[PDB]
């Protein structure tokens, strides 16, 4: 629930600063991962790739590679 | 802080002299995307750049990529 309100205020500041929301920033990882498969080790490594994408929104040569990674995994 | 104030007031004047220069970066898209042709998904992906507005007079490393994207898309 603390996670809930904190990622909700994080989406609040996301809509507060951005005008468009800049290609789906970090949101869906609650439910698009919970339905494909999966082995629990894959789910834990997924969250340890999901729960750290609070890094940057724009660009990038670093976060788009990880987004293609999590797409290819999901 | 004086020269910071001066740069920001002159940048204010500069984007208020950007009417039909930096303003009207859209209307080629209204000319050529509401013509005969384009499906509604192309309407969604093509009108992606109007309300991403306030970032080409501000900076940018990704300022003039909008005319490139539109002149290659529509």
């Amino acid at each position: 629930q603390r996670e809930y309100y904190l990622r909700e205020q994080m989406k609040a500041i996301q809509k507060e600063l951005g005008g468009e929301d800049g290609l789906s920033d970090l949101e869906a990882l609650r439910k698009k991962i919970e339905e494909v498969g999966m082995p629990e080790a894959v789910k834990t490594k997924a969250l340890k790739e999901l729960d750290r994408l609070e890094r940057m929104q724009q660009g990038s040569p670093e976060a788009t590679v990880a987004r293609t990674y999590l797409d290819w995994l999901t």
Side-chain angles (χ1 to χ4, degrees), chain A residues 42-57:
Chain A
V42 182
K43 185 185 286 185
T44 54
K45 188 180 184 294
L47 281 167
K48 295 291 183 183
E49 293 288 331
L50 299 174
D51 302 332
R52 273 78 192 169
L53 260 288
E54 303 90 358
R55 296 176 72 254
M56 278 83 73
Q57 180 183 1

Side-chain angles (χ1 to χ4, degrees), chain A residues 6-64:
Chain A
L6 286 180
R7 195 188 285 124
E8 285 294 326
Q9 282 109 28
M10 193 269 174
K11 295 290 103 187
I13 63 168
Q14 177 61 41
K15 187 65 175 67
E16 176 70 27
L17 187 58
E20 295 188 357
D21 54 355
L23 194 60
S24 74
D25 291 333
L26 178 57
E27 59 260 17
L29 319 172
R30 72 282 170 120
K31 71 183 173 66
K32 65 100 173 176
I33 293 297
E34 76 187 0
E35 55 90 17
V36 288
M38 59 175 66
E40 186 66 29
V42 182
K43 185 185 286 185
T44 54
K45 188 180 184 294
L47 281 167
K48 295 291 183 183
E49 293 288 331
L50 299 174
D51 302 332
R52 273 78 192 169
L53 260 288
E54 303 90 358
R55 296 176 72 254
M56 278 83 73
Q57 180 183 1
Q58 71 275 14
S60 70
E62 180 66 30
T64 59

